[PDB]
Design a binder for this molecule. Structure first.
Ligand code: COH
Ligand code: COH
Ligand SMILES: *[C@@H]1O[C@H](CO)[C@@H](O[C@@H]2O[C@H](CO)[C@@H](O[C@H]3O[C@H](CO)[C@@H](O)[C@H](O)[C@@H]3O)[C@H](O)[C@H]2NC(C)=O)[C@H](O)[C@H]1NC(C)=O
Ligand SMILES: *[C@@H]1O[C@H](CO)[C@@H](O[C@@H]2O[C@H](CO)[C@@H](O[C@H]3O[C@H](CO)[C@@H](O)[C@H](O)[C@@H]3O)[C@H](O)[C@H]2NC(C)=O)[C@H](O)[C@H]1NC(C)=O
Ligand SMILES: *[C@@H]1O[C@H](CO)[C@@H](O[C@H]2O[C@H](CO)[C@@H](O)[C@H](O)[C@H]2NC(C)=O)[C@H](O)[C@H]1NC(C)=O
Ligand SMILES: *[C@H]1O[C@@H](CO)[C@@H](O[C@@H]2O[C@H](CO)[C@@H](O)[C@H](O)[C@H]2NC(C)=O)[C@H](O)[C@H]1NC(C)=O
Ligand SMILES: CCCCC/C=C\C/C=C\C/C=C\C/C=C\CCCC(=O)OC[C@@H](O)CO
Ligand SMILES: CCCCC/C=C\C/C=C\C/C=C\C/C=C\CCCC(=O)OC[C@@H](O)CO
Ligand SMILES: CCCCCCCCO[C@@H]1O[C@H](CO)[C@@H](O)[C@H](O)[C@H]1O
Ligand SMILES: *[C@@H]1O[C@H](CO)[C@@H](O)[C@H](O)[C@H]1NC(C)=O
Ligand SMILES: *[C@@H]1O[C@H](CO)[C@@H](O)[C@H](O)[C@H]1NC(C)=O
Lengths: 551, 551
């Protein structure tokens, strides 16, 4: 078998076979040497005794609300801290990207082929003696058993951080521009070739789709007016392909950038809001530039919207997730004297860790009604009937489920949770502990340490035998959450760097783009710099209902 | 008409219309302010007063051989000098890229559509009152008149810098991996979607093409053996599309990565050499790694050859072109503590300036035959008849033509030169002086200053009237050359930043790729770091003939 199956190289060292039965570790720039890159260089010894634990940094940012209220009001200090928040993560992500599902070594194929999700850790080799390498049993536990024992929801567990349905649907809508698995090819492949925040979920992935969605007047996107309300146009009107079941009538087949957004009325809500936003921004640009044509209005509105999106994601969305008392800041300028790559490639593991189906409630509560999954799925009538204003009011009110802590996957999506496990396996993911080490965390020494509890730990011990072969995805869902938090440590430490990279990596954040001229002058620039989840709703939803990501 | 037609914003200010008849310049990070970005900031006045002119720097690098002799043999200094050389040429290229033929403002479409060449300067707006903006006559001069008066060769002018046919054909072979105009779409479109040094001219642009070219045994490329000599495989064996006239015999229809390489036996000489190199490297890696399969042998040899190419281009090819006494060095480590983007997008103007058709001789002198263009085109027989050894010996001793200095484009390719002019105009290129300002040079004040001579200057003055509307492409070919040099200032000052960006931008130069494990261990890494034009020929051409880029 492959001599690297046991994952012998530590500290970001690279493993390579050197004959049938031997390996060598490449310890270049790891700050370690020795056979397995485990012997620290002198500067590394000094860096390691002085480096705070990820859990210490977390504690500082989630306590001392009094000190943070001061820090948050000294612009120079707020800049300084946000600068640290951005750069301390940066070094963890390979950019240019490296591995993928087919390439556990660097290759031009893995670098150049945009159809692959990239990989933060190389796949376990095909001929390893155990699924994870060398440790554990010949087979992993039945995924149905892992699912039923520790993942599935008994009683609904609300998120103690107060995440609402505005948040859950925003997560779903936002991330589905860059997580668009190409099932024809396999779970390690993506249809999102832009690999980030390009808003293809609004504008379409291909130019042909964009052109069918565009009005070609005033930069605007096509729309329809129903009962005086602006909604997306239909499939028959646009000829834009969407996924709908057969029983869905022509008039309820709304056409948006992303093929799957008819699935959920929560997604259609956001699609409608962003469509209105784009056309609202067109109206403003046209007022500033009576001389501009359709094409420039469209393109400039897209860049503004991309900027709005990143702004909202950092300052409301990540802000809410973080539980930080520190006020996060979207400011591209903070990277201008730093080493940073303005490019991104979506990692398979980022897709995997974002399968937050425990956010989903048992029923969807709009106004006085309590819709089941059966009733809610593919039902855009519900949207037309209640309207965006009520959708916003209801979803702002409705609490979402806790993601970590175990046993919170709604039964309605059990098949999806099973697939995340099976497809992790099919893609040959390395173990939870391997991922933890890759992200500068201590491997868990037992199942009780992972869960912080006894009962689930015991189930997991019986299923997996060895903590070092525990799988990444179920571990994220059963991990001991931070105190009163939605997630545990592994989710935060893997998610945050993938997030920073995808947000700041965007070309609009580079010095040649980050200028008022890029966005049609100072007014367009200000739309980006003052954007928020509240203003997005206020500007585009009748009556300007109040909103946020917490209940 | 568009209020930016006159190009009012200086110093890399960005121009934007604010009404029908008004503009605003965006002076962000230019170091200037005021209406047209022409007033310098205090620190800018200083930076201006100190900073040496590009010509003064060229003089220092092409003189004082005694000093350079010391520096070159003192590694720490060589390295510090190369680091300057690399980082000064850097800030000149927009990266992430910006404009293209259809987008004179920044847009997601220009960012993301890899099918365009990018643009260093945006195009002249469609409705401008003159071809170059507002200066000059309503029509630029007949392009045949320009071609015939100042471009066409009367008498062959040899390169006083000593460039040979080995150099001339290396330039053509190498550049044709990234200059691959998609004539079906237009001159501003490329088929080279990798946008750099990916070796698609050897391996194929598509996976479909690569796979038909591969042996699938030991990592190797398919080949044939004719008279005991290894040549590329045929079109019939591989089913790889090549451009060939109907009349060419089955066996001389060589199939290589780049579809046009059967055009010229000079091109097929290098194609064959590089094919041999790839399979030679396979052999070395197979020896190192008996455990490796076909796929990893192939991909690893590919990365090795990419490195080989960059190394040769920097240390042999650019070295020769530069006329420097200083010894350029390929060493990715020199950028590791610098700010640099590991990405490239091929610029249209880089394609344009690289039309070095004056390099071409009047006949192709092999052994004691002197082949006309008519005889040499598409004649792979010549290659088989003489063999690679004679090709190398003959092309090493044959002088190439001077590029700058005027009147040296061979009549045989007059149509290509005319097309360079017409296509510049079709892509709405700004004038020579706009390009010189864009690359930190003073605009020429007269035609005589451009040519350094009287007679062509007068023909040009009569044709164009204003130096400020002189065109880029013809200017490059008529420019006063540097002393005893093949090129003039504008060629060097534009070409150099485009070059080093595309060389160092490659992902193999990034910290996560620049490691021995990437190339199969120390042995593969060493193939790269010891590569030379002489070693390429020595390892792959029978009899190991002497070669170099100069006669
Ligand atoms: C971010 C949180 C989030 C939420 C709130 C959410 C809400 C919901 C929801 C009710 C609104 C339903 C019925 C589903 C149902 C599904 N989800 Co999600 N999903 C979420 C994150 C994801 C992600 C990420 C994927 C992977 C998408 C991909 O790779 O294409 C996913 C995949 C799926 C799949 C497999 C899709 C396929 O292409 O086969 C189904 C089915 N689901 N989900
Ligand atoms: C770098 C030096 C160089 C040399 C030595 C060279 C040598 C020769 C040569 C010698 C046997 C011949 C017969 C030609 C003939 C042509 N070359 Co060049 N070319 C060169 C640089 C270029 C470049 C750059 C282009 C543009 C390529 C593109 O845009 O695809 C080009 C394009 C062409 C074209 C038109 C575009 C096309 O259809 O491909 C013709 C015809 N040629 N060339
Ligand atoms: C990026 O990698 C993708 C996966 O390797 C690749 O898709 C694959 O493309 C190949 C070649 O075009 C397809 O192979 C086809 O042709 C062979 C032999 O001629 C047939 O036996 C196959 O049935 C098939 O029709 C594969 O279908 C395809 N593999 C997949 C999708 O898993 C992409 O082409 C690559 N992208 C780029 C830009 O190169
Ligand atoms: C890369 O940018 C390219 C330049 O615009 C683009 O090429 C263009 O593609 C469009 C749409 O696919 C073609 O226009 C079509 O318009 C109607 C459809 O209703 C048809 O009647 C036309 O025949 C045509 O299909 C343009 O012809 C085409 N322009 C060209 C070839 O120069 C690429 O598609 C863009 N690439 C990506 C990945 O978005
Ligand atoms: C190098 O790291 C590897 C870790 O896999 C070590 O490999 C061996 O060490 C084990 C216990 O120390 C032995 O039982 C085995 O022979 C072997 N393990 C495996 C998985 O085969 C090796 O000791 C390390 N060497 C150094 C320098 O620490
Ligand atoms: C910088 O920009 C140019 C704009 O082109 C200059 O305007 C020019 O002023 C000239 C002198 O009065 C006029 O001859 C001419 O009308 C005008 N050029 C054009 C094409 O309109 C601005 O004055 C200058 N601005 C400043 C403040 O220096
Ligand atoms: C591919 C495009 C990327 C966009 C993805 C956007 C958001 C994904 C959000 C979260 C992933 C999971 C967990 C991390 C979230 C919050 C914890 C702390 C956040 C933090 O420290 O700043 C995080 C800071 O680094 C971010 O800038
Ligand atoms: C797209 C991938 C990039 C590969 C391009 C490779 C080769 C092109 C070679 C030279 C640049 C093009 C035209 C001439 C410009 C400069 C050459 C002369 C002097 C020089 O380069 O030195 C200037 C000094 O700075 C040394 O660099
Ligand atoms: C191979 C060149 C054919 C061009 C002939 C038509 C254009 C003539 O052009 C003329 O050529 C003369 C001789 O070089 C020069 O002295 C003149 O300045 C030039 O205008
Ligand atoms: C569709 O949703 C609507 C709400 O407008 C609901 O009344 C109806 O029962 C749903 N239909 C189905 C088939 O679930
Ligand atoms: C083909 O090249 C060969 C060299 O072997 C030569 O003898 C012959 O004349 C050439 N054919 C043409 C069409 O010039």
């Amino acid at each position: 078998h492959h001599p690297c199956c046991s994952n012998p190289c530590q500290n970001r060292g690279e493993c390579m076979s050197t004959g049938f039965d031997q390996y060598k570790c490449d310890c270049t720039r790891t700050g370690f040497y020795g056979e397995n890159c485990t012997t620290p260089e002198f500067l590394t010894r000094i860096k390691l005794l002085l480096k705070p634990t990820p859990n210490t940094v977390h504690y500082i940012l989630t306590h001392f609300k009094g000190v943070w209220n001061i820090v948050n009001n000294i612009p120079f200090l707020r800049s300084l801290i946000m600068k640290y928040v951005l750069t301390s993560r940066s070094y963890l992500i390979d950019s240019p990207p490296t591995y993928n599902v087919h390439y556990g070594y660097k290759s031009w194929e893995a670098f150049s082929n945009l159809s692959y999700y990239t990989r933060a850790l190389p796949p376990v080799a095909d001929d390893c003696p155990t699924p994870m390498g060398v440790k554990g049993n010949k087979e992993l536990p039945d995924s149905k058993e892992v699912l039923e024992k520790v993942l599935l929801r008994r009683e609904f567990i609300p998120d103690p951080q107060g995440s609402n349905m505005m948040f859950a649907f925003f997560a779903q809508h936002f991330t589905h521009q860059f997580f668009k698995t190409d099932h024809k090819r396999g779970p390690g492949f993506t249809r999102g070739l832009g690999h980030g925040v390009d808003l293809n979920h609004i504008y379409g992935e291909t130019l042909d789709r964009q052109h069918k969605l565009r009005l070609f007047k005033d930069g605007k996107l096509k729309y329809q007016v129903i009962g005086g309300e602006v909604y997306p146009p239909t499939v028959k009107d646009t000829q834009v392909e969407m996924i709908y079941p057969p029983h869905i009538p022509e008039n309820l087949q709304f056409a948006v950038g992303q093929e799957v957004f008819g699935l959920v009325p929560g997604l259609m809500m956001y699609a409608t809001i962003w469509l209105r936003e784009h056309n609202r921004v067109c109206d403003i640009l046209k007022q500033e530039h009576p001389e501009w044509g359709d094409e420039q209005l469209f393109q400039t509105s897209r860049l503004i919207l991309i900027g709005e999106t990143i702004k909202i994601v950092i300052e409301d969305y990540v802000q809410h997730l973080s539980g930080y008392h520190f006020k996060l800041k979207f400011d591209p300028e903070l990277l201008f004297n730093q080493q940073f790559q303005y490019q991104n490639r979506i990692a398979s593991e980022f897709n995997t860790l974002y399968h937050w189906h425990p956010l989903l409630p048992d029923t969807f509560n709009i106004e006085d009604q309590e819709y089941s999954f059966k009733q809610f799925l593919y039902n855009n009538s519900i949207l037309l009937e209640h309207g965006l204003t009520q959708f916003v009011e209801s979803f702002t009110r409705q609490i979402a489920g806790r993601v970590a802590g175990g046993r919170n996957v709604p039964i309605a999506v059990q098949a999806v949770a099973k697939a995340s496990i099976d497809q992790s396996r099919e893609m040959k993911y390395q173990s939870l502990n391997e991922y933890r080490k890759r992200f500068s965390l201590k491997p868990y020494t037992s199942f009780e340490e992972l869960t912080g509890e006894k009962e689930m730990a015991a189930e997991l011990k019986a299923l997996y035998s060895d903590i070092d072969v525990m799988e990444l995805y179920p571990a994220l869902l059963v991990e001991k959450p931070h105190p009163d938090a939605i997630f545990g440590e592994t989710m935060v430490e893997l998610g945050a760097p993938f997030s920073l990279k995808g947000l700041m990596g965007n070309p609009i954040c580079s010095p040649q783009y980050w200028k008022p001229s890029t966005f049609g002058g100072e007014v367009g620039f200000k739309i980006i710099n003052t954007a928020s989840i509240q203003s997005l709703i206020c500007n585009n939803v009748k009556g300007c209902p109040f909103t946020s990501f917490n209940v």
